[PDB]
């Protein structure tokens, strides 16, 4: 009988075995206890699916014709204004928008297929809102514009900031407004290794590495201040990241 296809986003859909007098595939799925059906062109798994909850909400599950991506969307009553979208796309990302009464987004929250978060709530119509990067060990917290998400950790006179652009560009600066010259941080960052190297005195004293697996690392220099030694230290918790800006 029909066949079982797994889908992205830990859902399963089954396809019938043979087509309809039209050519069409019949599709079932259960998502968390709500049955969906659907018809489609392709014998896969691919196509649509749609439901009703128990509150009248629409529900409908899109699969990509290659099964790469799923979306599934709630809707109000009448089908024609946006609650929720989950959509997990081919690279495992899993990013999910809730929308106001309105059907404008208000909150979302992308979910790397490493599990850190960028969390965006509270999102109005200019594309303002509240940020937060969920990671491994710790969570970084900031603001989001149309323009960039500025995430901030402050220790002392230091506010170390991360910029990642309306595009996902990370960048990062350092600002000190310590007055003895002597004591005060200045920064420089390098986009060809993702790298802020700080300097004190005149002399460099670290560099922090903002991999591309989301983690943060921190590595000292020589009293030389030109060559690097031992080897980086992977950031566990907020706090070694304010020991870093000390």
Known sequence: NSVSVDLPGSMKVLVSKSSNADGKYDLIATVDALELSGT????????????????????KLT????????TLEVFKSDGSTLVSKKVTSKDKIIIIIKFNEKGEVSEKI?????GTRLEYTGIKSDGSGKAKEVLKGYVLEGTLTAEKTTLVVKEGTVTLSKNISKSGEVSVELNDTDSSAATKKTAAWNSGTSTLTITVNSKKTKDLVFTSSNTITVQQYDSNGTSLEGSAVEITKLDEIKNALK
Do not use: C, H, M, Y
């Open 110 to 114: 992308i979910t790397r297929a490493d």
């Open 40 to 59: 489609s062109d392709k014998n896969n798994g691919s196509g649509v699916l749609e439901g009703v909850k128990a509150d009248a909400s629409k529900v």
């Open 63 to 70: 699969i990509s014709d290659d099964l790469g991506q799923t």
